[PDB]
Amino acid sequence: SELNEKLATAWEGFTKGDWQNEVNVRDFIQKNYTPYEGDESFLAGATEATTTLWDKVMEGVKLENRTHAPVDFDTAVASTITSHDAGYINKQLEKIVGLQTEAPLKRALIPFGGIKMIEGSCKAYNRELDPMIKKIFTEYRKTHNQGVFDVYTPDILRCRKSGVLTGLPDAYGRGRIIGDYRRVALYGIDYLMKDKLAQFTSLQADLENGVNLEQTIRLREEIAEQHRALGQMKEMAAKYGYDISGPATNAQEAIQWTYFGYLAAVKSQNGAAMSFGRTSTFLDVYIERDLKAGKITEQEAQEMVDHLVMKLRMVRFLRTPEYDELFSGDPIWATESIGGMGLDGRTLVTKNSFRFLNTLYTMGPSPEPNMTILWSEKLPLNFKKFAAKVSIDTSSLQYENDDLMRPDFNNDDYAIAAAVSPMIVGKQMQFFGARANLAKTMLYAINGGVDEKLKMQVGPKSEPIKGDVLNYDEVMERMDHFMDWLAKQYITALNIIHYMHDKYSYEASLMALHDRDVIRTMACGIAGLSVAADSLSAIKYAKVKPIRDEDGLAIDFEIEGEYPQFGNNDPRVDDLAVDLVERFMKKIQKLHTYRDAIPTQSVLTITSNVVYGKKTGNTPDGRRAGAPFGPGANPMHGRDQKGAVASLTSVAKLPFAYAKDGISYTFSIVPNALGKDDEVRKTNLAGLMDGYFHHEASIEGGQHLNVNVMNREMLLDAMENPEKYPQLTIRVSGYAVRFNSLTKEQQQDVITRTFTQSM
Amino acid sequence: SELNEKLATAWEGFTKGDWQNEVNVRDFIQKNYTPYEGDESFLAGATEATTTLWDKVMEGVKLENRTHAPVDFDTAVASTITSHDAGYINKQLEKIVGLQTEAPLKRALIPFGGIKMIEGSCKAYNRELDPMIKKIFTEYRKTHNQGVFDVYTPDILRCRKSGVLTGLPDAYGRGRIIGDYRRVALYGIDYLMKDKLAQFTSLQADLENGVNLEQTIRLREEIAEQHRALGQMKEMAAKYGYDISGPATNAQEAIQWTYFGYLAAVKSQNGAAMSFGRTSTFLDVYIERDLKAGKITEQEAQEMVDHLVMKLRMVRFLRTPEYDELFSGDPIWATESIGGMGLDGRTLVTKNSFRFLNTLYTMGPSPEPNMTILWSEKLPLNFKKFAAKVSIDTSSLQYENDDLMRPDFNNDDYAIAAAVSPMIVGKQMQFFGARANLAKTMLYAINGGVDEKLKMQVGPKSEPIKGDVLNYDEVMERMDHFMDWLAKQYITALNIIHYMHDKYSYEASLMALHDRDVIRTMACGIAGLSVAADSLSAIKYAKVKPIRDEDGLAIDFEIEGEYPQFGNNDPRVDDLAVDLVERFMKKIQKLHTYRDAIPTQSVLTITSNVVYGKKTGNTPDGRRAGAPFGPGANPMHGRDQKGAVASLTSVAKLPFAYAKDGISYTFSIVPNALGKDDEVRKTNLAGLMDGYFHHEASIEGGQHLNVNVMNREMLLDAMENPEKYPQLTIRVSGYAVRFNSLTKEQQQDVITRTFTQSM
Ligand code: NA
Ligand code: NA
């Protein structure tokens, strides 16, 4: 009889299902959500409390952007789930509470990942690290950072320094984990703890029988840590005057409970991406019930959502300047997956879908949360148009192919982690791997493993390519070999990293909100795809002559004739890009991985396009030394000149089947290119996306799309006059940032990118 | 092939061999030691400095015995290799320096093993644990203790509470590891670090190739920790004004360097047994060279040895009262393996062998170091007699069969770890497992798994024997079934323990003095062998009537008729003991173990004979409830009544082939039983041991022998008048203790034991 007296009271009115007898958030959603096909006319505006709160927080935000530094941060407190006291912006006004530290925007110290990065941050921002904290995390509690560097090979160190394998998660939280925070709201902590205890007990037999001994012992300890973490969540919430031992009884509690689950996560881990999940529709179930019972008004519903979202706009992590160049714009990737279609055919779009998007209006444009629209051609036209409208007005949204991912998973409850990495909520995670420099790998092939800037042997010692003119078949053959080498060094580095991360910074509070067994993938990223593809194209269709120095190192290239560049829908070059994605995937696929994580690939870079570009010399495609690579899977800056449909088609050709961790594309189009008025623009934008995401048995389609609707002139004005654009937000690589949050160099990359002038 | 000048100078006069090109302490010993077949006439007496130093330390020792508590201990410092400043008894007098803390006998806090035990100690000895230390080791740095209890099964907890599996290393250092401290003297730290770096690099290929991935990553991290520890040893020594980066250049430096290696170990780990190894003969090589060069006198040689040994008499560890009852007498097991024979036939006995034994004269009797004579019939009669003499005079030595172990290992460089556990120095270690209650297992068989004292279901629920009279076939049948159960719970408990110990308290400084790959055994102990064997005899040769309660649980037994008792050379009972040793061994042998540690067995108990005895009810052999079991493999108190040769023969029958972790026997004989004068006594004692250790292809022989030459009346006087016997030492279970260091109850066990009245 799985139904307590309190569970029945909290679930009064809800439709029965397996979800009442076991942890199954998906079933609860399926049996209870109300599909919405109407428009945005019901949306309410911001309340005075909301505006007062947000305006106060924006003062800290302006300070952050102006100083390019934290407003404040801990120097003597080691952060945990229960370390800090309750903190508020204004307790009398907040409907949803919870801050990482005791003060708005004050960043914490998460030492378990490594003390050296904290020291770097302290010195960079002019603050003194407490000596006791330093001592503890250098002599008593070994950290992730130290575990990794103790096992690294000198080959990996060389790759890190030369810029072929740089920025891997050896100096920051790996992230890429989304605990199902909805579970706290649905079941309450006590129920989840009892479920974890059962999971723990289910491993006893194997333990005693010596079946997979070490793996069993590891999992039991992890589950024990998870159980303990759940208890700490209650203590954390209690500091705020809340008792979350039982299930949420109303809308407010559902939102608060879910957020508390996430709060424990961001108080204990500092993953590069700390995503929210697929929660908007789930929360709609509680909002609908309260509206129907007349307990809450529509404006009050918006306020609750605004306060939740406002908190997500306040997540912060103490990062080093080095991290800042790899992941620019003070990002969090508090990703929310909105809408999508169910497996049964109905849309997963709800009124809450609109409420979340509406936060861009009630509180203005914002980079976080990273609101992602799960697009499908079958979505209600009303929602398609409104999403497009929000993009045109704010450039704060990203779109990802639900018509491609839903069938691939055969699940309608997956969420987007970080930028473009899909996972079934509570049943899957990824071992983050950042990205590798594919372009530099090509130069190594031509230069016999000798780095073109450092002039030292990095890759395998081999003969450099001879001849005054480059030959496609030879170059591709040598590149294929060096890709084997890159694959081995990359997987080896990640194997070490994740072994140490599980050991020294196991994400207990997040894993506590997952099933007993979690599917894991080893996500390998590729940077500079278009630089490599175009370089090969130039070599194949034009006449590329290497300019070598006294030692025979190719330090420049002279190109005779023009050649097809990626992004112009010319198969001659696009097939090469497709080929590269396929090649690397087949290589990492054959290698052994830690905890048997299934290797996956992503054409994603984040700000590595700038960092690797800065460390890569002249390339065969004509790109000059030090120049930024294209963001993610984008064509090189300004090379896609045949309009929107053409560039979208090239990117869509890229095989998601060989890049399951995602394919990022940052698309920027001028207002007039979409139409003369908003109605035409909305219709056209939605149309562009329907074509890009069009999925058929013979046509895979695009996976992701960042959408910026702006004029380059506007950004130029923002560069000169910051104070005039406090909340100006733009998509840059698989997330958004406030334009004023970037450095001058980072902004330089953004303004020199392709601004689509026509369709 | 130019040998580093530092090595060449330091090794001037030494005979060449492989040892100069690789770490090989055994080869150095073989190519350089000088066998000694002479007597003790060369031995010098103590110097004034020695006597002054020791008398001062004895004042602290008296205080320890009187209060049965530490003289002092840390309350706010977490101990590591470099945590403490140099400490001295009197710097102006010490020839060999080094203390665990900054003061003589002051005990340290070794938190990595668990904070709860430290709290218990603080509470028990009226001191308060610094709050910061408690916080660090409960929230930031997880300990061995918490890791084990997080994974334990409720079955193991029950077994722990009932007294069937109690005192396992889940609340104290596992120990059973002997780093080759001789390596520091021979090669110096720098050379060892270079060698470790090579070992680290040798694992790169497998790491990159994904061969045994997790095992490779684990070993690399361990080697990195070892390398780092070696560097810390230099820093530790530097605090004392010594530079040990290079090899020892003389006798004093050889002794000091070796001790420094051991000092790092006892400053960082708190293993139950922290053994010294097989060092006396090794050190003789340096002492001989200095004597021959006239750089040192014989008295000065004795002084150096006295100061080294004096330091070993000062090793202390903060223990809880619970630990005190499991391992009584404030033990350390600083075991030194003396003498033995080489594989080539010459004796490994040297002048230093005599010097070490002579410390019992120069500084009086002492429990530590635990000097163990590697006995062989081929030993020089001069040494055989002197050892026997020392036993007669001090009762401070133990003997172990070199004629049995040397051929078994086919190595002449093995050492005795703890009490009776052999290991090839620097190439082998043991996963300590304490001991299981075999006697209680028999009661469970008869009582259907219900605890005869706690009335709870501990063992598997089965039907209890309904018989009015106990039958051998029926009892043994269930006995076998329950031994299978005991074996499974025991191995499972140890698998968890050692997984956690490798994870949270890896012995870096000790493992740094071992080869890259170390052989590991899972040592399982058996307690109450004689109680179980005799009980089986009372059922197979007499009439046992089970006295049951209102639930049918046998809580007592009636015995009608005499029956054979173990220890009288009566095969009817001896064959049952031998059978039991064989049975349990074959059972644990079939189970999977952590890190593939080869399961071994030992009939050893230490003070568990008292603890388990206290928790075991009446048994079929007639032993009353709460009564102590016999120590180790000893016959039950007073049951062996047919003289020395008879009892020695029974124990010798026990198969070392099925108990590779050792077989302990505590033999106490009255002076007059050995002869009318010392010369006859020495000759007879040596003769008794030659017969006991006699090894033949058809006769295995005894493995270990504790030798006490005393009268019960003497101990009775010591009980009444402590102050009269400050240094009185006795062998009790596989080590020695000062009689005044035991509790009243523990002393009670000792005086009621068998005092052999004749041969
Ligand atoms: Na595609
Ligand atoms: Na034997």
Side-chain angles (χ1 to χ4, degrees), chain B residues 404 651-652 654-656 663 700-703:
Chain B
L404 177 61
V651 182
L654 297 181
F656 176 66
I663 299 173
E700 188 191 71
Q703 192 256 346

Side-chain angles (χ1 to χ4, degrees), chain B residues 623-637:
Chain B
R623 181 197 69 91
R624 305 310 300 168
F629 290 166
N634 274 65
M636 263 296 288
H637 301 36

Side-chain angles (χ1 to χ4, degrees), chain B residues 468-470 535 538-540 542-546 557-560 620-621:
Chain B
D468 38 64
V469 175
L470 290 183
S535 290
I539 305 174
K540 184 166 169 289
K543 242 184 290 133
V544 185
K545 193 173 301 303
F557 302 89
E558 281 185 315
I559 303 178
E560 192 171 311
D621 66 334

Side-chain angles (χ1 to χ4, degrees), chain A residues 204-221:
Chain A
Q204 177 172 336
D206 285 345
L207 170 61
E208 295 174 336
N209 300 335
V211 173
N212 289 319
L213 194 53
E214 291 182 40
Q215 302 95 311
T216 304
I217 292 176
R218 179 176 60 204
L219 194 52
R220 305 244 301 162
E221 187 182 26

Side-chain angles (χ1 to χ4, degrees), chain A residues 78 80 82 112 132 136-137 139-142 146-147 150-155 200 204 207-210 213-214 217-218 220-221 224-225 228 488-489 492 495-496 499-500 503-504 592-595, chain B residues 78 80 112 132 136-137 139-142 146-147 150-155 200 204 207-211 213-214 217-218 220-221 224-225 228 488-489 492 495-496 499-500 503-504 592-595:
Chain A
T80 67
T82 68
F112 300 108
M132 187 68 251
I136 295 171
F137 300 96
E139 300 183 53
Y140 308 148
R141 173 52 151 77
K142 195 171 186 179
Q146 199 52 80
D150 267 3
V151 179
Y152 262 171
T153 62
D155 300 63
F200 174 85
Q204 177 172 336
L207 170 61
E208 295 174 336
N209 300 335
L213 194 53
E214 291 182 40
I217 292 176
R218 179 176 60 204
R220 305 244 301 162
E221 187 182 26
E225 284 286 322
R228 171 177 294 117
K488 189 168 97 294
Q489 299 299 128
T492 299
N495 282 336
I496 295 167
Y499 176 103
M500 295 304 168
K503 183 170 187 178
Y504 299 118
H592 288 138
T593 53
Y594 169 67
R595 215 199 273 233
Chain B
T80 66
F112 306 97
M132 186 70 253
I136 295 170
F137 299 96
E139 300 184 51
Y140 308 150
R141 172 52 151 78
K142 194 171 189 179
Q146 200 52 74
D150 267 2
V151 179
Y152 263 171
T153 63
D155 301 62
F200 174 84
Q204 179 171 335
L207 170 62
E208 295 173 336
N209 298 337
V211 174
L213 194 53
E214 292 183 39
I217 293 176
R218 178 176 60 204
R220 274 175 71 92
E221 189 183 22
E225 284 286 320
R228 171 176 294 117
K488 189 168 97 295
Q489 299 294 129
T492 292
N495 283 336
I496 295 168
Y499 175 104
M500 295 305 168
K503 184 172 186 177
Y504 300 118
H592 287 139
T593 54
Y594 169 67
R595 215 198 273 234

Side-chain angles (χ1 to χ4, degrees), chain B residues 585-602:
Chain B
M585 183 59 226
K586 293 175 180 178
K587 296 178 184 302
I588 63 182
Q589 183 168 245
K590 299 181 289 186
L591 310 179
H592 287 139
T593 54
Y594 169 67
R595 215 198 273 234
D596 293 319
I598 310 162
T600 55
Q601 170 178 233
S602 61

Side-chain angles (χ1 to χ4, degrees), chain A residues 256-326:
Chain A
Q256 182 65 82
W257 270 221
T258 298
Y259 176 64
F260 272 147
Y262 179 76
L263 184 59
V266 297
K267 272 170 173 282
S268 61
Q269 306 298 329
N270 64 347
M274 295 300 282
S275 304
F276 206 59
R278 165 113 74 143
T279 75
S280 56
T281 281
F282 165 86
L283 295 172
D284 197 70
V285 179
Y286 291 77
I287 294 181
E288 263 295 309
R289 183 172 69 167
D290 280 7
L291 286 170
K292 267 30 214 289
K295 170 161 190 168
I296 234 73
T297 61
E298 175 57 55
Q299 185 179 87
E300 285 177 331
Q302 259 298 164
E303 185 178 46
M304 277 172 229
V305 169
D306 287 348
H307 290 207
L308 166 73
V309 167
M310 173 165 69
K311 286 304 198 303
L312 298 184
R313 293 187 173 199
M314 302 178 62
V315 184
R316 294 294 185 277
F317 287 117
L318 183 62
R319 309 293 199 202
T320 63
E322 178 186 77
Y323 182 96
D324 181 62
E325 47 183 33
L326 263 356

